[PDB]
Write a protein that binds this ligand. Sequence first.
Ligand code: UDP
Ligand code: GAL
Ligand code: MN
Length: 291
Amino acid sequence: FMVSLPRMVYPQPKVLTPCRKDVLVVTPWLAPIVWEGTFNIDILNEQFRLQNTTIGLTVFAIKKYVAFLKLFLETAEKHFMVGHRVHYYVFTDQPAAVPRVTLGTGRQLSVLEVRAYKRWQDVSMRRMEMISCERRFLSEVDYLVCVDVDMEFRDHVGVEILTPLFGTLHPGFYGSSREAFTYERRPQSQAYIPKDEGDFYYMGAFFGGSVQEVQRLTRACHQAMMVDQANGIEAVWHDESHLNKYLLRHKPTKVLSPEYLWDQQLLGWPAVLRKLRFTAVPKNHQAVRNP
Ligand SMILES: O=c1ccn([C@@H]2O[C@H](COP(=O)(O)OP(=O)(O)O)[C@@H](O)[C@H]2O)c(=O)[nH]1
Ligand SMILES: OC[C@H]1O[C@@H](O)[C@H](O)[C@@H](O)[C@H]1O
Ligand SMILES: [Mn+2]
C-alpha cells in the first residue's frame, strides 16, 4: 500500500511540448527510455522513499580487478541512490583487498567470497550463476542492480532507473542498425539472434530490476550458458550475448540511455548526452586480465 504524495510545487508538464525531441524516450512496448530531461527526480524520490526502497548493488572484483573497487565505491557514495537505503554486495576472491570506504548513513557493504576462474570470460560469465545466494537478496533488498567494477560514477544514478526489469543501451551501438549489432549469430548457441530480429544492443555492464526479475534473468542466462558449454560453444560476447537474447524475449520495463554506461576515452561527449553518469575507467585488457 502506497500513501499519498505530499503537496509539491514543480513546473507543469506540457502535453504539446516534448521533454526531448532528439531521441526516442519510450520503446514500442511502452517502456520509458531514461534520458536527462525526461524525469522529475523530486517526484520519483518521494515515490520511492514512501516505499522505503532498498537497492542492492552487485559488483565483482576478481583477481586484479580489486584495484577498481576504491574509485567505484567512493564515487557510488557520491552519486548512486543517495538518500535511499543501499546494500553493496562485493563478490571477490580477495576479501582482504577490499578497500575500507566510508559509507553514508543507511548504506552497508557485504563482502561475499567466491572462487576465481582462470579465463576472464568465465569470470565475466559466471557472474550470472553467482548472482542467481537468492533467498538472501529477497530478504534484504527490493531491487538489484548488477554492474561492472572497472567503472566510476560521475553524475546522478538514482531511482529513475528502478522498475521490474531494465537493460542499458550499449554506448557503441545506440545509433546502429540491428544487422550491425554484435549479437550471437550462430544458430547452435542459445544466445542466437537472427539478423532481422532485435530491438537494441544492451550492455552486459549494467542491468537490474526487482529481485524476482533479476533472479529470473540470471538463472535463465546461467542455464543457457550451461547448455552452450555442453554443446561446446561459447557465445561471441559471453554473458552479454545471453543478456541480449533474454531481453529480446522478455522486454525490459525501462531501458537506460547510454548516459548510464559511457566510455569518454573511446567515444567522447556527444551532444545527445546531457550527462555522463557512469563511465569506464581506462585499463589495459591484456595486463589486467592475466597474472
Ligand atoms: O579478471 C577479471 C575479469 C573480469 N572481472 C569482472 O567482470 C566484469 C567484466 O569484465 P570486463 O570489465 O573486463 O569486460 P569489458 O568491460 O572490458 O568488456 C569486470 O568489470 C569485473 O566485474 C573481474 O572481476 N576480474
Ligand atoms: O561488441 C560488443 C563489445 O563491445 C566492446 O566495446 C565492449 O568492450 C565489450 O565488452 C562488448 O560489449
Ligand atoms: Mn567492464
